[PDB]
A paper describes a structure:
The NIMA-related kinases (Neks) are a family of Ser/Thr protein kinases, first discovered in Aspergillus nidulans that are conserved in eukaryotes. Nek7 is 1 of 11 Neks found in humans, and contributes to the assembly of a robust mitotic spindle apparatus. Human Nek7 is a 34.5 kDa protein, comprising a singular canonical kinase domain made up of a small, 5 β-stranded, N-terminal lobe linked to a larger, mostly α-helical C-terminal lobe. The intervening cleft between the two lobes forms the ATP-binding pocket and active site in which phosphoryl transfer takes place.
We also determined the structure of Nek2 bound to the same inhibitor, to enable a direct comparison of binding modes. Compound 51 inhibits Nek2 with an IC50 of 1.42 µM, ∼50-fold more potently than Nek7SRS. The overall binding mode of compound 51 was similar in both structures: the purine scaffold lines up along the kinase hinge region; the substituted phenyl group sits on a Gly residue in the post-hinge region (G92 in Nek2, G117 in Nek7SRS), and the sulphonamide substituent points towards solvent; the cyclohexyl group fits between an Asp residue in the post-hinge region (D93 in Nek2, D118 in Nek7SRS) and the Gly-rich loop. As with previous structures of Nek2 bound to purine-based inhibitors, compound 51 forms three H-bonds with the hinge region of Nek2. The orientation of the substituted phenyl group of compound 51 is clearly different between the two structures: when bound to Nek2, the phenyl ring lies flat against Gly92, and the sulphonamide-amine substituent points towards Asp93; when bound to Nek7SRS or Nek7WT the phenyl ring is rotated so that the sulphonamide-amine points towards the N-lobe where it interacts with the side chain of Arg50. The equivalent residue to Leu113 of Nek7 in Nek2 is Tyr88, which partly fills the space occupied by the phenyl-sulfonamide of compound 51 in the Nek7-bound pose. A striking feature of the Nek2.51 structure is the contrast between the highly ordered core of the kinase and the poorly ordered C-helix. The C-helix in the Nek2-ADP structure has B-factors similar to the rest of the kinase core, whereas the C-helix in the Nek2.51 structure has the highest B-factors of any region modelled in the structure. There is no structural evidence that compound 51 destabilises the C-helix directly. Instead, it appears that it is unable to compensate for the loss of the stabilising effect of ADP on the C-helix.
Author numbering: 4 to 16, 21 to 130, 142 to 160, 178 to 189, 194 to 279
The structure:
Amino acid sequence: RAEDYEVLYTIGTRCQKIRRKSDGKILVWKELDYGSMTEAEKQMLVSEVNLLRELKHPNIVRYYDRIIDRTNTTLYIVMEYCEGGDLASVITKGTKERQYLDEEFVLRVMTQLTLALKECHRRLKPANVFLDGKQNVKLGDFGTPYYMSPEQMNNEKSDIWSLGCLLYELCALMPPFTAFSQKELAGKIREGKFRRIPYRYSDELNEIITRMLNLKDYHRPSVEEILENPLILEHHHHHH
Ligand SMILES: CN(C)CCCNS(=O)(=O)c1cccc(Nc2nc(OCC3CCCCC3)c3[nH]cnc3n2)c1
């Protein structure tokens, strides 16, 4: 079945951009080497991939297929290609070009990732968030821990904290809590103090990101409360 696809190139490490021969459809696959995975593990692997095969949602990276080649003892997980790359590169680009992201773009990310989470909760970091060709935002996969919530370090509201951190970093081009060591990082996170996002961003956007970064999980907004915010409009949602 791997022969049904042509590898175009390796995106990163392997994650490869591929083309399906039957119709030219562009995809990616992740090549997993199960050559050392014991018989006991391979069950934990199969169930994991089958639950990854559960989420059909426009803001979640879509799973298409799984391929085994016992030749190289290699499993290929085939999924949607996201042409716009990851948010980390967008943050990098902004930093290097000394240019803050548009509030409209930040609102799109907030809206569509909240909907992804809403779906995940029913059934998080910049390198795991992808853009497609039409501004749409996609959650994938669904060493200093910049986004670790205070309760996790001492819960659906923990995801809200993490979304708060990501949106903050999209606005400020830096995370809300920074430190040279983990113990210092933990100190800062527990104190819950951070600079306002840049002043080009509205008080309203600052307020919701700040609410997501409340020290108390029960004071952070739910996904439903986030989506009720008057900032969030139809054009911020996914569009085919
Ligand atoms: C931190 N950043 C600098 C990352 C490195 C820089 N490349 S990049 O910015 O992601 C980039 C550029 C152009 C297209 C795409 N499209 C894409 N990439 C995936 O995974 C990449 C993989 C992530 C983990 C480690 C290895 C790489 C996809 N997975 C499912 N659909 C995918 N679509 C990505």
